[PDB]
Design a protein around this ligand. Structure first.
Ligand code: NA
Length: 379
């Protein structure tokens, strides 16, 4: 269908009729700053309980909006229902009754950056992608038993969110689910079998990691992904961990993207030769990082790998690296010396951008070989 179903009006609300003799609110035509979703609507000879807030009803609401009250008849909140309601403080249940909300749609509260009170989460079984993306004032969240995954970007950039309780029923934490949050600790429940890329990237306040998952063990307070073949990928080193040095264990095959981003204290890192690849921005914004011992089996320095590593003074790029990608050392203001092997044939101009102390480039090849290095790479 290229059109939505036939809608009726009851006061400031429009609605459609559901197959189970309930109604879905599809439009709001008022301009209140304190919203009360109706528990019932009338059409013809019948009264319909309101079971759903339709997709986008308050999406980009142009008027001032501070609070929303939902009746306990509502079992579903549509996608983008309160998208960009940036002064919305609270979403409560009428008469302080228990929430009956079971499903929350994609981006339902995305950009509700002042939202602090959300009791609608208490009996939910499904929450879709980015439902609380940029809810910058949420402080603690409890996901109830019955939720089976944390959908992608669910709490991305929830800057105040310092504690999240995940239930035993969660089997997946999707991509970017907690990117940029204020989590001080993480507990991975036993049934987690998938953690998506950057689920814990930019977690600047993280100090402890615990896990009951055999697929995602916490080994010496570091989160890993363990593959069926026994290989491990290091996925999250806690940024607030105070140890000046860390040696990545033998048996780790990959340092995943942003695994060591924003480490406030880490000064020295050592890689085993089992490490064959490093993800984008693996050590970005590590301001105390001074010494790096590389694996002999890596062949690339990925994008932004050491971007913002402002204490880095000297670095020896291992023989066998064939390319140094965009922004690899961008903003390394104290970098004075870099040894580049003749195997490096690609270095974009941005790789050493804002490297004002850089006065000693030790290149093991000839001037002709140096001039043959390609400076081409997209963004
Ligand atoms: Na090598």
């Amino acid at each position: 269908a290229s059109d939505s179903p036939m809608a009726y009006t009851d006061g400031s609300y429009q609605f459609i009729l559901n197959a189970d003799n309930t109604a879905t609110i599809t439009k709001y035509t008022g301009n209140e700053h304190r919203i009360t979703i109706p528990a019932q609507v009338t059409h013809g000879a019948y009264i319909y309980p309101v079971s759903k807030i339709g997709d986008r009803v308050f999406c980009n609401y142009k008027y001032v909006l501070t609070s929303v009250q939902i009746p306990d008849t509502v079992t579903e909140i549509g996608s983008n229902a309160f998208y960009n309601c940036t002064s919305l403080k609270r979403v409560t249940i009428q008469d302080n009754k228990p929430s009956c909300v079971k499903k929350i749609g994609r981006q339902a509260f995305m950009f509700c950056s002042e939202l602090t009170d959300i009791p609608i989460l208490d009996s939910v079984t499904e929450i879709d992608s980015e439902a609380f993306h940029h809810c910058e004032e949420l402080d603690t969240v409890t996901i109830p038993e019955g939720v089976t995954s944390v959908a992608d970007g669910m709490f991305s950039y929830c800057y105040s969110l310092h504690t999240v309780t995940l239930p035993d029923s969660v089997t997946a934490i999707e991509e970017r689910a907690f990117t940029g949050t204020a989590l001080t600790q993480i507990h991975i429940p036993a049934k987690v079998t998938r953690i998506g890329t950057n689920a814990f990237s930019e977690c600047f306040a993280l100090s402890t990691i615990t896990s009951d998952s055999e697929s995602y063990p916490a080994i010496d307070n570091v989160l890993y992904e363990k593959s069926a073949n026994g290989d491990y990928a290091l996925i999250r080193y806690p940024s607030q961990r105070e140890d000046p040095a860390f040696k990545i264990p033998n048996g780790v095959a990959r340092i995943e993207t942003h695994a060591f981003d924003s480490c406030a204290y880490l000064a020295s890192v050592k890689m085993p030769d089992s490490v064959v690849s490093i993800g984008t921005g693996a050590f970005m914004n590590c301001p105390a990082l001074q010494d790096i011992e590389f694996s002999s089996r890596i062949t690339e320095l990925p994008e932004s790998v050491f971007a913002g590593c402002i204490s880095l003074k000297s670095i020896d790029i291992p023989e066998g690296i064939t390319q140094i990608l965009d922004d690899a050392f961008a903003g390394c203001e104290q970098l004075e010396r870099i040894a580049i092997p003749s195997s490096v044939t690609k270095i974009p101009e941005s790789a050493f951008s804002n490297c004002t102390a850089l006065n000693n480039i030790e290149y093991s090849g000839s001037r002709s070989q140096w001039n043959a290095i390609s400076t081409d790479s997209g963004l």
